[PDB]
Amino acid sequence: TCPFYKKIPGTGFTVDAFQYGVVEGCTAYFLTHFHSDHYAGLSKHFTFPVYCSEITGNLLKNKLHVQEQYIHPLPLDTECIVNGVKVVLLDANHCPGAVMILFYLPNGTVILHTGDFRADPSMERSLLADQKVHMLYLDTTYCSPEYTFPSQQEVIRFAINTAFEAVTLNPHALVVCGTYSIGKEKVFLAIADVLGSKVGMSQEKYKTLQCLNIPEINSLITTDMCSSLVHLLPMMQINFKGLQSHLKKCGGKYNQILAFRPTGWTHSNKFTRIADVIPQTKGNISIYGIPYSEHSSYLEMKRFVQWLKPQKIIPTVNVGTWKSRSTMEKYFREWKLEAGY
Ligand code: NI
C-alpha cells in the first residue's frame, strides 16, 4: 500500500509509486528520475500513463521495455495540462533526466515535489520565482549539519589533476572508474577528456549512456576496451581483488591501476579537505574515494527552503525512524524562525 507522502491531494496523481500494484484512484503515475528505488515496480507489462522527462522516457523504453503508448515525455520549463491540471517540470540538478514537479491544484494550492535534487542558487531564477508554494515534498537525504562536502567543480578538479599527473609519470597506468546507476558521468568524462581517450565499458552500460542526450557522445565513449585507457566497471568490482583480476585481462598492456569510487558523503568528510585526500594502496593498485554528491548539502538545502518559504514541508527521505523525523522537524522550525516566515 502506497504511503501518504507519494500522493498528491486533490488529484488523480502519484509520484515514484510503481511498487504498490494498482493505486486506487491514480489516473497518471509521475516518475522523477531513473533510479531503482524510485522506478521499483515498472516493467514491459505496465499499462497506465507514465509522465516524465524525455531522457527518463528513453530509459523506460530501451532499458525496462515499457511500451511506447504508455510513455508521456514532457519538455522542461513549460506549462503543460495533464488530466485537467497544470504542471511544470524543472531540472533537479541530480542525474540525467531528473526533474522536480510543480502542480497547480484546481483549488488554488501550489505544490513542489523536488524528487531527488541538489539545491542550487540558479533555482531561485527558474519559474519558481513567479509564485507562492503552499506545500514542499523535500529530498531530505542530508538534512543534518554534519553533512558537508565540496562543490562538484572542486571534486572534478581534484580527479582530473590526479589522473593527469599519474598517467604522465607512467604512460602504462590504466584508470578505472566505478558506476552502479546513472548519474556522476562527469567523473569519467572529465578524466578521459584530459587523457585524450574515449571511455571503455560493457555493452549494457554503453546502451544506458546512449539514452542520455549527451552532446557528441559518440566521440566520447566506446565498447572497444583495448582502444581506451579509461575503463568503467561495476562499483562492486572497485576493490583490490576485483582490480587485480581486471588487470590480468588487459594483455600486459598496463602495469598499474589508478581507480576512483565516487561515493556520497562518508565520515572522512568530517576531518579531511578535498585537497588532502589520499588513496588506499596495495602494490601497483591505488583507490581514491571521492565525495561527488548529487544531493543537497545541509547548507544548500537550508538556503533553498529559506528562499522558497513554504507553508508546510513533507520529507521524502529518512522518514522511517522517530529520531530522524524529530531531528528534521527541529531544523525546519529553526529555519523558519531565523528567516521569519
Ligand atoms: Ni536518485
68 and 83 together in one domain:
yes
Range of the domain at 258: 148-295
311 and 336 together in one domain:
yes
Closest CA to 295 of 286, 304, 287: 304
What resolution in Å is listed for this PDB structure? 1.5
With the CA atoms of 43, 6, 81 and 127 taken in that order, what torsion angle do they form, in degrees rounded to the nearest 10? -120
Could you tell me the maximum CA-CA distance found in the chain, to the nearest angstrom?
A: 68
129 CA → ligand 1 middle, Å: 25
14 and 99 together in one domain:
yes
Please check whether residue 64 is in contact with residue 42, taking contact to mean a CB–CB distance below 8 angstroms: yes
116 CA → ligand 1 middle, Å: 5
98 CA → ligand 1 middle, Å: 8
Q: List 259's β-bridge partners, or say none.
A: 176, 287
158 CA → ligand 1 middle, Å: 24
Please check whether residue 137 is in contact with residue 15, taking contact to mean a CB–CB distance below 8 angstroms: yes
293 CA → ligand 1 middle, Å: 11
260 and 170 together in one domain:
yes
165 CA → ligand 1 middle, Å: 32
Please check whether residue 173 is in contact with residue 243, taking contact to mean a CB–CB distance below 8 angstroms: no
C-alpha cell at 226: 583495448
15 and 123 together in one domain:
yes
**What is the DSSP-derived secondary structure letter of residue 295?**
S
For the chain, what is the domain count? 2
193 and 240 together in one domain:
yes
159 CA → ligand 1 middle, Å: 23
25 and 138 together in one domain:
yes
111 and 226 together in one domain:
no
105 and 185 together in one domain:
no
94 CA → ligand 1 middle, Å: 7
* Residue found under cell 576485483: 242
133 and 176 together in one domain:
no
111 and 186 together in one domain:
no
CA distance 138 to 316: 6
Strands 173-179 and 256-263: parallel
* Residue found under cell 579531511: 272
Which CATH number characterizes residue 112's domain? Answer: 3.60.15.10
C-alpha cell at 45: 507489462
Which CATH number characterizes residue 187's domain? Answer: 3.40.50.12650
237 and 222 together in one domain:
yes
